[PDB]
């Protein structure tokens, strides 16, 4: 009681020897005591430098944008949350991260490793062992995107050698890398998609926006209370999925057994509104879009469908069922050379039956700045083009640029309907790109970029219906995009009618794609998108007129895509058979019809499945819709 | 979240059998006469002179009969329910649960009350159910891992809960101890812990019996090493974690230095009617050394606000109060190297400022002549190279132009 | 004496009011005082960031060698 400064007093020294002995032990212990304490400072200093079923995240550099979409699509389906979350990553955490991490929802949920997936000692700290998945996820920040998919391999190797059985979720960057994790369970190419997605928006306005929607889990609830009727409208038809059942077990198709794929479709959409979009066999292990009218269903089927809610979370409309309680479809059903490219840029290539020139064509003549032997044209005017131009502005012309050119050449579109393709590009293409390229009918290069008026009248902007800006260009991490967002907005400025459509790496700067700062409409569309963020919707940059209008894109969706695999392990196989990515045989392709008043005598949506199910056996994805919005 | 429910119900089941156990020692009095259950029921006196301590006091305490049962019953329920989660979760360990401490205060406290069932006159028989509470304080624990009911709140909330155990364990040892010398009640012995965890030790109250001395060192050796590994916690979480009025204005820049700091406050701050106004920086870079030394200055530190942050973070905005800003200057970083990237900013940052704010006076300073016609729709710009150039030209023309105009657009009051 | 931990004892509370006050007491002011140190910590630590006859030395980079 005296060493701890209680002092009672009840026993005290009564003598003047035990009284000078207790001060000279107080000052002792007050002498010897901090020393030590200072020791076990100087130690501490020098020192400072679960559950079941987790899930491990390996970046290289975990920034706030990834991360929480990431946790957003994760934690959207309750069959994940009971999962805890391992990221590991080389880099120290970062700022804007530690926040996050700090929130009470995340602190226990969110496992952040500072390690290498190389090092089996950091993938021991991480229980890759016992994760039920391992998200491998390239950096697109890193400038050297050779570099940053040679890492995503080797850590997609050290995983596999680490645990061999960890499903493993890669995202991949260049199409040239893609055949060395094959391996993997899911593989996601950013360049394919993105060029893919990009060309799709030439033929079928807005197909990167419907793509964005279906792979993005929602309940249907955005913009529920505006009072317009297509933000209404809108917001409830974002909640659509892709989702699979077996036949036998799907009380949307069971009827259907022993009747055709289109019969069933349009009857299982007039009755409940569902989409049957296409089916996988018990036989094979390939689903086919659209198989058509001469499939016939069996219960063995499983039928991929798009509907607001899985049918077994509809278990409301079936007892809402019980609450209640044209021709008709039937049960029963220069010219071009027509070919396969010859050179395949890259090992995967799917290879697709394009429109083919009857002979190659010399790198000179794929050159629309230079005259030739063959020709002295110049520019875009001297060519005398039937068709609009569609004008690529790209940095490097690679695989992915490819990947642009095969869905615009393809077989199953028009002929008369082609459009040229002039590459708008930074540098001089490799003589691998042009002989990739040389075989295709109306494909021309150009050097130049979007920010320079010259090479774009050279181009033919006067005369293209796309303009497509892949230009690639911070600490900042936003300001990313502001020299694309801004030489972009300098052509809506010029040419207000031409249509441009870019990809952004943020969804948060969609909204600057074409801004009319002195515009009520689209200011007064910023508080909507505040409120639907207040309401923790993941999809809050819905309502932006660019984005809805399929303008803008960002290939952080194709992040999403990877996660929804974790649940959906069709959904990447879906969106590249609707992106014409992977081709097999007896499956559909996506394509759009217009609605001309000659179709208006087809009054409505349920009307145009039965005609379209009853003599081309097309199945209506859904409508892009133009309104009169005067600025 | 069954399982949460079942550690929620032991929780209270341990703090409910804590409270009994206080309920029984204000209605046990042991002047009335002390003994084993029935017979030969002995009084007693403490004598100071004579060393030897009567341990009939401290061994028995008369036990009511319904206290006795009731206590019995949430006794065995809460060993039900321990051993419950004991045979429910082996995790691939049989062995090692006995030595982690919490099974062995478990069955000490619990299963003498289980034994005293077999022999009658054993029911009037001690047994530290005060003890109990550092279970209680083990079963909250676990219940932060799952529901919050604020990351730190649990650490301080545990921080305590481990003061309150020490306390109670503190009170009803010495109230207990005591009962054999100078009878102490649960009042006063509450009083003796109180002074004597925060080292005041007045000494009216100190224990007269070994017995009691030593539960007096042994409580203060105890909390001496387990308070210090909470304050460790503590420290560890404090440290993690480190890493107004109307009518403000927002500063929106890239990189803010002193001397564009310092031409912002000497001009805005020249106006009367702009004193009342305080002066937010967003700039997401973080705080410049000499900034810091200004904005340490009284004069300074309560009108200017520094936020590191970007205008292009609707959050950041929100930070800013920037929908409730008398005006935001968007001014272009002259020092880099690259101004059309600066120009392109700063484009980004007034239509940043233009969406979350349609009602904000945008201020806006951009450098290169082509990329004004972006922030037309601001209230104000400057081009930084019209301006120079045509200065610079007209001193070709009227000398001295550019000192005419720069004397002209500063405040001053003509005293120099 | 009491806020300063001393105790001598000499004076003491000897009724359950007076006691339970001091009780009270010493719990509002081991609650009370630590917020106060802790503001005085967040302060003291943004803070942290002679004779006739001296010459100056003015350098871009002083290193050992210079010096
Ligand atoms: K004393
Ligand atoms: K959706
Ligand atoms: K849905
Ligand atoms: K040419
Ligand atoms: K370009
Ligand atoms: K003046
Ligand atoms: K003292
Ligand atoms: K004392
Ligand atoms: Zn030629």
Same mark, same amino acid.
């Given at each position: 009681?005296?060493?701890?400064?209680?002092?009672?007093?009840?026993?005290?020294?009564?003598?003047?020897?035990?009284?000078?002995?207790?001060?000279?032990?107080?000052?002792?212990?007050?002498? /010897?005591?901090?020393?030590?304490?200072?020791?076990?400072?100087?130690?501490?200093?020098?020192?400072?430098?679960?559950?079941?079923?987790?899930?491990?995240?390996?970046?290289?550099?975990?920034?706030?944008?990834?991360?929480? +979409?990431?946790? =957003?699509?994760?934690?959207?389906?309750?069959?994940?949350?009971?999962?805890?979350?391992?990221?590991?990553?080389?880099?120290?955490?970062?700022?804007? /991260?530690?926040? /996050?991490?700090?929130?009470?929802?995340?602190?226990?949920?969110?496992?952040?490793?500072?390690?290498?997936?190389?090092?089996?000692?950091?993938?021991?700290?991480?229980?890759?062992?016992?994760?039920?998945?391992?998200?491998?996820?390239?950096?697109?920040?890193?400038?050297?995107?050779?570099?940053? +998919?040679?890492?995503?391999?080797?850590?997609?190797?050290?995983?596999?050698?680490?645990?061999?059985?960890?499903?493993?979720? /890669?995202?991949?960057?260049?199409?040239?890398?893609?055949?060395?994790?094959?391996?993997?369970?899911?593989?996601?190419?950013?360049?394919?998609?993105?060029?893919?997605?990009?060309?799709?928006?030439?033929?079928?306005?807005?197909?990167?926006?419907?793509?964005?929607?279906?792979?993005?889990?929602?309940?249907?609830?955005?913009?529920?209370?505006?009072?317009?009727?297509?933000?209404?409208?809108?917001?409830?038809?974002?909640?659509?999925?892709?989702?699979?059942?077996?036949?036998? +077990?799907?009380?949307?198709?069971?009827?259907?057994?022993?009747?055709?794929?289109?019969?069933?479709?349009?009857?299982?959409?007039?009755?409940?509104?569902?989409?049957?979009?296409?089916?996988?066999?018990?036989?094979?292990? &390939?689903?086919?879009?659209?198989?058509?009218?001469?499939?016939?269903?069996?219960? &063995?089927?499983?039928?991929?469908?798009?509907?607001?809610?899985?049918?077994?979370?509809?278990?409301?409309?079936?007892?809402?069922?019980?609450?209640?309680?044209?021709?008709?479809?039937?049960?029963?059903?220069?010219?071009?050379?027509?070919?396969?490219?010859?050179?395949?840029?890259?090992?995967?290539?799917?290879?697709?039956?394009?429109?083919?020139?009857?002979?190659?064509?010399?790198?000179?003549?794929?050159?629309?700045?230079?005259?030739?032997?063959?020709?002295?044209?110049?520019?875009?005017?001297?060519?005398?083009?039937?068709?609009?131009?569609?004008?690529?502005?790209?940095?490097?012309?690679? =695989?992915?640029?490819?990947?642009?050119?095969?869905?615009?050449?393809?077989?199953?579109?028009?002929?008369?309907?082609?459009?040229?393709?002039?590459?708008?590009?930074?540098?001089?293409?490799?003589?691998?790109?042009?002989?990739?390229?040389?075989?295709?009918?109306?494909?021309?290069?150009?050097?130049?970029?979007?920010?320079?008026?010259?090479?774009?009248?050279?181009?033919?902007?006067?005369?293209?219906? =796309?303009?497509?800006?892949?230009?690639?260009?911070?600490?900042?991490?936003?300001?990313?995009?502001?020299?694309?967002?801004?030489?972009?907005?300098?052509?809506?400025?010029?040419?207000?009618?031409?249509?441009?459509?870019?990809?952004?790496?943020?969804? &948060? =700067?969609?909204?600057?794609?074409?801004?009319?700062?002195? +515009? &009520?409409?689209?200011?007064?569309?910023?508080?909507?998108?505040?409120?639907?963020?207040?309401?923790?919707?993941?999809?809050?940059?819905?309502?932006?007129?660019?984005?809805?209008?399929?303008?803008?894109?960002?290939?952080?969706?194709?992040?999403?895509?990877?996660?929804?695999?974790?649940?959906?392990?069709?959904?990447?196989?879906?969106?590249?058979?609707?992106?014409?990515?992977?081709?097999?045989?007896?499956?559909?392709?996506?394509?759009?019809?217009?609605?001309?008043?000659?179709?208006?005598?087809?009054?409505?949506?349920?009307?145009?499945?039965?005609?379209?199910?009853?003599?081309?056996?097309?199945?209506?994805?859904?409508?892009?819709?133009?309104?009169?919005?005067?600025? | 979240?069954?399982?949460?429910?079942?550690?929620?119900?032991?929780? !209270?089941?341990?703090?409910?059998?804590? #409270?009994?156990?206080?309920?029984?020692?204000?209605? $046990?009095?042991? @002047?009335?006469?002390?003994?084993?259950?029935?017979?030969?029921?002995?009084?007693?006196?403490?004598? $100071?002179?004579? !060393?030897?301590?009567?341990?009939?006091?401290?061994?028995?305490?008369?036990?009511?009969?319904?206290?006795?049962?009731?206590?019995?019953?949430? @006794?065995?329920?809460?060993?039900?329910?321990?051993?419950?989660?004991?045979?429910?979760?082996?995790?691939?360990?049989?062995?090692?649960?006995?030595?982690?401490?919490?099974?062995?205060?478990?069955?000490?406290?619990?299963?003498?009350?289980?034994?005293?069932?077999?022999?009658?006159?054993?029911?009037?028989?001690?047994?530290?159910?005060?003890?109990?509470?550092?279970?209680?304080?083990?079963?909250?624990?676990?219940?932060?891992?799952?529901?919050?009911?604020?990351?730190?709140?649990?650490?301080?909330?545990?921080?305590?809960?481990?003061?309150?155990?020490?306390?109670?364990?503190?009170?009803?040892?010495?109230?207990?101890?005591?009962?054999?010398?100078?009878? #102490?009640? #649960?009042?006063?012995?509450?009083?003796?812990?109180?002074?004597?965890?925060?080292?005041?030790?007045?000494?009216?109250?100190?224990?007269?019996?070994?017995?009691?001395?030593? #539960?007096?060192?042994?409580?203060?050796?105890?909390?001496?090493?387990?308070?210090?590994?909470?304050?460790?916690?503590?420290?560890?979480?404090?440290?993690?974690?480190?890493?107004?009025?109307?009518?403000?204005?927002?500063?929106?820049?890239?990189?803010?230095?002193?001397?564009?700091?310092?031409?912002?406050?000497?001009?805005?701050?020249?106006?009367?009617?702009?004193?009342?106004?305080?002066?937010?920086?967003?700039?997401?870079?973080?705080? $410049?050394?000499?900034?810091?030394?200004?904005?340490?200055?009284?004069?300074? !530190?309560?009108?200017?606000?520094?936020?590191?942050?970007?205008?292009?973070?609707?959050?950041?905005?929100?930070?800013?109060?920037?929908?409730?800003?008398?005006?935001?200057?968007?001014?272009?970083?002259?020092?880099?190297?690259?101004?059309?990237?600066?120009?392109?900013?700063?484009?980004?940052?007034?239509?940043?400022?233009?969406?979350?704010?349609?009602?904000?006076?945008?201020?806006?300073?951009?450098?290169?002549?082509?990329?004004?016609?972006?922030?037309?729709?601001?209230?104000?710009?400057?081009?930084?190279?019209?301006?120079?150039?045509?200065?610079?030209?007209?001193?070709?023309?009227?000398? @001295?132009?550019?000192?005419?105009?720069?004397?002209?657009?500063?405040?001053?009051?003509?005293?120099?």
């Amino acid at each position: 009681v005296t060493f701890s400064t209680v002092g009672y007093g009840d026993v005290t020294p009564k003598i003047w020897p035990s009284q000078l002995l207790v001060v000279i032990m107080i000052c002792v212990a007050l002498v /010897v005591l901090p020393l030590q304490f200072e020791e076990l400072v100087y130690l501490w200093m020098e020192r400072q430098k679960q559950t079941e079923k987790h899930v491990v995240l390996c970046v290289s550099s975990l920034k706030i944008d990834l991360l929480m +979409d990431f946790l =957003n699509e994760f934690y959207a389906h309750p069959r994940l949350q009971d999962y805890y979350v391992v990221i590991l990553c080389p880099t120290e955490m970062d700022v804007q /991260v530690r926040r /996050v991490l700090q929130i009470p929802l995340w602190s226990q949920r969110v496992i952040y490793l500072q390690g290498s997936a190389l090092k089996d000692q950091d993938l021991m700290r991480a229980k890759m062992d016992n994760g039920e998945a391992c998200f491998i996820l390239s950096s697109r920040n890193e400038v050297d995107r050779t570099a940053a +998919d040679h890492q995503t391999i080797l850590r997609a190797w050290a995983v596999k050698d680490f645990a061999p059985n960890c499903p493993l979720y /890669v995202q991949i960057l260049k199409p040239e890398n893609k055949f060395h994790v094959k391996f993997a369970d899911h593989v996601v190419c950013e360049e394919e998609c993105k060029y893919a997605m990009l060309a799709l928006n030439c033929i079928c306005p807005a197909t990167s926006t419907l793509i964005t929607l279906l792979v993005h889990t929602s309940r249907g609830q955005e913009g529920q209370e505006s009072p317009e009727q297509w933000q209404r409208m809108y917001g409830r038809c974002s909640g659509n999925e892709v989702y699979h059942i077996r036949m036998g +077990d799907s009380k949307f198709f069971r009827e259907y057994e022993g009747k055709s794929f289109t019969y069933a479709a349009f009857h299982a959409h007039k009755k409940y509104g569902v989409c049957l979009i296409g089916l996988k066999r018990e036989d094979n292990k &390939s689903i086919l879009l659209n198989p058509g009218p001469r499939h016939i269903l069996a219960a &063995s089927d499983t039928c991929f469908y798009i509907n607001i809610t899985k049918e077994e979370n509809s278990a409301f409309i079936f007892k809402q069922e019980e609450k209640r309680k044209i021709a008709p479809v039937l049960e029963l059903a220069v010219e071009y050379v027509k070919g396969y490219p010859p050179n395949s840029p890259y090992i995967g290539s799917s290879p697709t039956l394009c429109h083919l020139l009857p002979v190659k064509a010399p790198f000179c003549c794929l050159r629309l700045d230079k005259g030739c032997k063959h020709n002295s044209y110049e520019d875009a005017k001297a060519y005398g083009f039937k068709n609009k131009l569609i004008i690529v502005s790209a940095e490097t012309a690679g =695989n992915g640029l490819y990947n642009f050119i095969v869905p615009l050449r393809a077989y199953y579109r028009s002929r008369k309907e082609l459009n040229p393709i002039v590459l708008l590009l930074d540098n001089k293409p490799d003589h691998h790109f042009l002989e990739a390229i040389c075989c295709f009918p109306m494909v021309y290069y150009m050097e130049g970029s979007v920010d320079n008026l010259d090479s774009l009248l050279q181009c033919g902007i006067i005369y293209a219906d =796309n303009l497509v800006v892949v230009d690639k260009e911070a600490e900042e991490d936003y300001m990313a995009d502001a020299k694309t967002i801004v030489n972009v907005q300098t052509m809506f400025r010029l040419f207000p009618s031409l249509s441009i459509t870019t990809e952004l790496t943020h969804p &948060s =700067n969609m909204r600057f794609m074409q801004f009319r700062a002195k +515009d &009520s409409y689209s200011l007064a569309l910023s508080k909507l998108e505040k409120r639907e963020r207040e309401n923790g919707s993941n999809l809050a940059f819905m309502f932006r007129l660019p984005f809805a209008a399929g303008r803008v894109f960002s290939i952080s969706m194709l992040d999403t895509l990877l996660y929804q695999s974790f649940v959906k392990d069709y959904m990447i196989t879906i969106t590249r058979l609707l992106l014409g990515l992977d081709t097999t045989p007896g499956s559909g392709y996506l394509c759009a019809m217009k609605i001309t008043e000659g179709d208006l005598w087809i009054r409505t949506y349920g009307r145009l499945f039965q005609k379209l199910c009853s003599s081309s056996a097309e199945i209506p994805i859904g409508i892009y819709r133009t309104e009169s919005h005067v600025f | 979240r069954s399982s949460l429910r079942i550690r929620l119900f032991n929780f !209270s089941l341990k703090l409910l059998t804590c #409270l009994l156990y206080i309920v029984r020692v204000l209605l $046990d009095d042991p @002047a009335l006469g002390i003994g084993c259950w029935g017979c030969p029921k002995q009084n007693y006196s403490f004598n $100071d002179s004579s !060393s030897e301590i009567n341990w009939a006091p401290i061994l028995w305490v008369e036990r009511k009969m319904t206290l006795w049962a009731i206590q019995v019953i949430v @006794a065995i329920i809460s060993f039900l329910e321990t051993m419950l989660l004991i045979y429910l979760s082996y995790k691939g360990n049989i062995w090692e649960q006995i030595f982690r401490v919490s099974f062995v205060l478990e069955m000490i406290n619990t299963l003498p009350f289980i034994i005293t069932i077999f022999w009658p006159p054993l029911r009037n028989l001690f047994i530290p159910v005060f003890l109990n509470c550092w279970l209680a304080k083990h079963a909250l624990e676990n219940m932060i891992n799952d529901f919050h009911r604020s990351a730190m709140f649990n650490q301080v909330l545990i921080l305590f809960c481990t003061l309150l155990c020490l306390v109670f364990t503190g009170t009803c040892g010495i109230q207990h101890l005591e009962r054999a010398g100078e009878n #102490l009640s #649960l009042l006063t012995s509450f009083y003796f812990c109180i002074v004597t965890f925060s080292t005041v030790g007045y000494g009216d109250v100190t224990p007269k019996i070994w017995p009691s001395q030593l #539960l007096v060192v042994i409580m203060i050796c105890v909390a001496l090493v387990v308070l210090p590994l909470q304050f460790e916690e503590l420290v560890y979480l404090w440290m993690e974690r480190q890493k107004q009025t109307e009518k403000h204005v927002v500063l929106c820049v890239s990189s803010l230095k002193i001397d564009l700091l310092m031409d912002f406050l000497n001009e805005f701050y020249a106006h009367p009617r702009l004193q009342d106004y305080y002066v937010v920086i967003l700039c997401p870079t973080e705080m $410049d050394v000499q900034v810091r030394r200004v904005l340490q200055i009284p004069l300074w !530190s309560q009108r200017v606000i520094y936020l590191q942050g970007s205008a292009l973070k609707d959050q950041d905005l929100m930070r800013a109060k920037m929908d409730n800003g008398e005006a935001c200057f968007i001014l272009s970083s002259r020092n880099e190297v690259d101004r059309t990237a600066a120009d392109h900013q700063t484009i980004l940052r007034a239509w940043a400022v233009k969406d979350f704010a349609p009602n904000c006076p945008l201020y806006v300073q951009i450098l290169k002549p082509e990329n004004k016609f972006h922030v037309k729709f601001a209230d104000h710009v400057v081009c930084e190279e019209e301006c120079k150039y045509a200065m610079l030209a007209l001193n070709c023309i009227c000398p @001295a132009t550019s000192t005419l105009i720069t004397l002209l657009v500063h405040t001053s009051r003509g005293q120099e």
